[PDB]
């Protein structure tokens, strides 16, 4: 079956594909801003928010992916083949978990209606050619 | 942060450790149960339950892991180290979503309080010495 | 004084003698059931039930017996008489807390009246001649 | 898991660790004052008190420890190794069952609020050096 | 800043200097006393008293001093100069917080005015010559010695 | 007894480790602004705040640590121990006293909620890639 993870939150993969690769902070920097803002709500028996439920799964999805890269570096025989796998988890599979971590942290920080309104205006900006756009990208921090 | 995937739903990792490792059905058998029973709701544009939201992320977590096992199939021309990676995803990494898929499919079908009471009742069954346990295990089939 | 540990809870030593000796699960299997199900309450600063108060003393009684078996491990340099002591605590002394841990975990999970009725119902089952008893024993799994 | 046996009664192991070893009577003298004061309440099907439930377990804990020392003296081969075990049950494991027997007998005799108020004032007295304390320890017998 | 830890609570350093140096119990004996009676309050998410706010920093002051003495042991390969620093942390720096732990535990247990009247009455007792001094020193027990 | 020094003030060690380590002003500058702004209120027979009660103990803790450093500089014959100990006391304990002094001085100056919001905002600002944040770092300021 075909599930996009954002459709229950009012977005799509097509809406978040306009953000470039160097728009999201690193995965260590998304896990730090969740552990420092919402830790008593993520380590809680309550449901709190639907953005809290999807953020708990995205953290433990990465904790098993960092569990994989520790296994790959420990018990593969040749070092040549193991350097493609750990580079795949951090870069290729790590990019999909950044925008999952970015979307749910920002929907808790700024609001869900603000992030969806920002993703429209960022899509207009990056679809415009660089000669006909303002030089600075729009930012989020309304608060 | 030591975050618990089942504490939100009134369970724990140590309560899910009452069931053995080779008790959960395979991932292909659990994704067909999700397809046949809950496909209009997992593809719905609204979250219907907290179990649906944790189940949509559990399928995409396995979908990311199947793009990985396809990638190690197409790459890593050393053949002896390719089979170490793709069998790790299918066996070792596939287990921790297999408890995650089993817990959320069964809590959508039978309810929260039925699966939590089944987790205790399977705890009594596997604890009993083999001279005094029944030959049948408990099944979640509360429905006729 | 000939004091009865289960008479307070509506049972007796001779009603607990309906179950055989090798029916109760091991002490490591019963302390994990107490850990997974009742750890906020056994470490609570208030007594929640008379079964909690008798269960906190049953765990500390085994905790005193494990400091003893560690002490006979570190001391008693005669090796033939060290193994007589530590196997007595694990097998012989560990049994009378194993009925004590089983009775209070099961009475917190299923209730008093369910375990007392299970003690009678297991009495009928073990009494029946083997030509006419079922191949299944009763389990306390009243919960689905 | 980590349980202290006194926390449900409003005390701790840290509160009762200030009482010295020679503060409690012998285990035969704690079992005599329970069998002579509360025997119709300990040999009873009722719950009576939470101090009664914890006292029933502490008596039968010692009855299995005296069962052990009878076994050790009967069927160990050498007498040299058996004299360390029976001295361990009576002294080392016997000291932990004295303060369990003392705390629950005294909470029934004087009251729970009196024993906790006495354990504070006995802690002030024995933490004071002997040159700056009164020479007599405080006593319990308010009745 | 000529600042004073007890001046806020109605005392002084010199009023705490009535008690001698070898009067306060050891740091292990006040940490066991604090954790016995005040552990849900010293780890509470709110401040309960100015004694609780000042006792949380005094335990944290001792915690930073014990990670220091641990660090001097794992490092500092000269044994002649290592042991005199760990001795300075334990017996010299620990004395200034033993008065801080004793003062704030006792004002939580018996009250501010009871400890402040005890410091005066122990001041009369210790400056009396030993020929005219009574045998039983003052003590801030809430119960009498005969109960 | 595990006590968080900022827990009663609505923060934690994790929220103050959210900012980088070389952000907090030095211990000399923080004691300078404490002695400039709040000296008649820290040398006072009143409490006036929980922040004043914590700031006095922080200043006295740093005074005891500087007495320690003066003592180690006074009498230790090993020159490498004078290189190790008083550099540890500065660069490892002064960072924690820098966070404590900065937190309490800023909470006295700007308010507690403004300092907590500034902690969250500056952490998320540092974490953000530089092309998608405001170009200059935020400060607390009382000047309109």
């Amino acid at each position: 079956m075909d599930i996009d993870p954002y459709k229950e939150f009012g977005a799509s993969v097509e809406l978040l594909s306009f953000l470039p690769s160097d728009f999201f902070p690193s995965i260590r920097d998304l896990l730090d801003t969740a552990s420092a803002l919402y830790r008593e709500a993520l380590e809680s028996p309550e449901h709190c928010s639907p953005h809290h439920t999807a953020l708990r799964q995205a953290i433990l999805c990465w904790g098993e992916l960092m569990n994989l890269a520790t296994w790959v570096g420990s018990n593969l025989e040749d070092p040549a083949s193991r350097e493609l796998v750990v580079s795949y988890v951090n870069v290729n599979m790590g990019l999909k978990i950044r925008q999952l971590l970015w979307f749910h942290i920002s929907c808790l920080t700024f609001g869900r209606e603000t992030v969806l309104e920002y993703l429209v205006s960022f899509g207009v900006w990056i679809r415009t050619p660089p000669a006909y756009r303002p030089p600075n990208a729009p930012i989020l921090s309304t608060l």
Side-chain angles (χ1 to χ4, degrees), chain A:
Chain A
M1 78 198 93
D2 315 318
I3 311 155
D4 46 359
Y6 314 97
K7 201 202 273 186
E8 50 180 353
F9 308 110
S12 307
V13 196
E14 286 97 32
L15 195 75
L16 277 84
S17 42
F18 292 118
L19 315 157
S21 176
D22 52 355
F23 177 77
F24 320 107
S26 200
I27 318 105
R28 194 42 60 201
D29 305 300
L30 270 308
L31 287 181
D32 279 2
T33 176
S35 167
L37 272 72
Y38 322 99
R39 205 192 184 184
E40 323 285 5
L42 288 185
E43 304 261 1
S44 179
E46 281 156 30
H47 298 277
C48 299
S49 200
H51 293 103
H52 275 121
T53 310
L55 200 51
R56 288 158 176 145
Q57 308 283 321
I59 290 174
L60 290 151
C61 182
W62 182 245
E64 296 291 315
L65 281 175
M66 266 302 122
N67 208 327
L68 161 68
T70 297
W71 188 91
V72 171
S74 276
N75 44 51
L76 285 184
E77 320 99 309
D78 75 288
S81 279
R82 82 178 74 179
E83 290 290 13
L84 301 107
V85 194
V86 193
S87 315
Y88 186 86
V89 190
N90 279 90
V91 177
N92 278 72
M93 279 195 286
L95 179 54
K96 303 202 61 142
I97 206 67
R98 285 185 207 170
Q99 38 192 268
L100 197 53
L101 275 157
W102 174 87
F103 179 74
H104 293 308
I105 285 171
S106 298
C107 281
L108 287 159
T109 311
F110 310 107
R112 195 186 50 89
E113 292 100 320
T114 296
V115 171
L116 298 188
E117 210 182 26
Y118 170 74
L119 280 159
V120 168
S121 316
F122 198 90
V124 178
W125 180 84
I126 201 163
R127 266 151 37 215
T128 318
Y132 312 107
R133 63 162 78 149
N136 298 317
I139 63 180
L140 257 172
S141 195
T142 192
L143 54 90

